[PDB]
């Protein structure tokens, strides 16, 4: 699969931006749960279109998604929130800023910071779909896992191939690559912190989300 072949497949596999039911802490968080629960369905049928994913076991596919799902929702959130400085576009009709965070506030700022980092870097869509797929394949990789490593390496080739096209020098490609991949540490952090917050909410949710939680 060519690099350009890689980007197209990923670009074409993108899920749709879903809408909220907008217009308290319970109400808002209730809305985000509703949204996340519907996004999860698209995410699942999106992962299937991610190169290599279908070649994995059904159990492995379950593991990868159980680990990465919130990471994937969050990098989706941060991406569509790029051109909206100081706000988080959870949905086209659900655009929120820091001062309605309400134990969320810490998680909000982290998401806000990630989106600022993306905008600073002028993150391209092609690069975004690359990162998101890396997350699905990487976040739970730790038999033939290493087919996953072969695919991960392919995606890395795609990232670099993209960057060379934008006129980035050899040194500029290596640095940008690290910068993108380093952001995935933070997304890992937000996800983990997010899970914890949700674990506090369970003992006050969607039936599928609950299944996704106890996996952690």
């Amino acid at each position: 699969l060519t690099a350009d072949q890689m980007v197209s497949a990923l670009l074409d596999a993108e899920p749709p931006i879903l809408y909220s039911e907008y217009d308290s802490e319970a109400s808002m968080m209730g809305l985000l749960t509703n949204l996340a629960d519907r996004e999860l369905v698209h995410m699942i049928n999106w992962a299937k279109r991610v190169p290599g994913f279908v070649d994995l076991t059904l159990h492995d596919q379950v593991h990868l998604l159980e680990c990465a799902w919130l990471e994937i929702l969050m990098i989706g959130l941060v991406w569509r929130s790029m051109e909206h400085p100081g706000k988080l576009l959870f949905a086209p009709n659900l655009l929120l800023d820091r001062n309605q965070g309400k134990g969320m506030v810490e998680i909000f700022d982290m998401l806000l910071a990630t989106s600022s980092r993306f905008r600073m870097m002028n993150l391209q869509g092609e690069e975004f779909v690359c990162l998101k797929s890396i997350i699905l394949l990487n976040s739970g990789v730790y038999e033939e896992k290493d087919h996953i490593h072969r695919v991960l390496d392919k995606i890395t080739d795609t990232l670099i191939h993209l960057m060379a096209k934008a006129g980035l020098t050899l040194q500029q490609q290596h640095q940008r690559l690290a910068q993108l991949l380093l952001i995935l540490s933070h997304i890992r952090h937000m996800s983990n912190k997010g899970m914890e917050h949700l674990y506090s909410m369970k003992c006050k949710l969607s039936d599928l989300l609950l299944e996704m939680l106890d996996a952690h």
Partner: peptide, 7 residues
Amino acid sequence: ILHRLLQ
């Protein structure tokens, strides 16, 4: 649920 949806 996740298994059935993958299927």
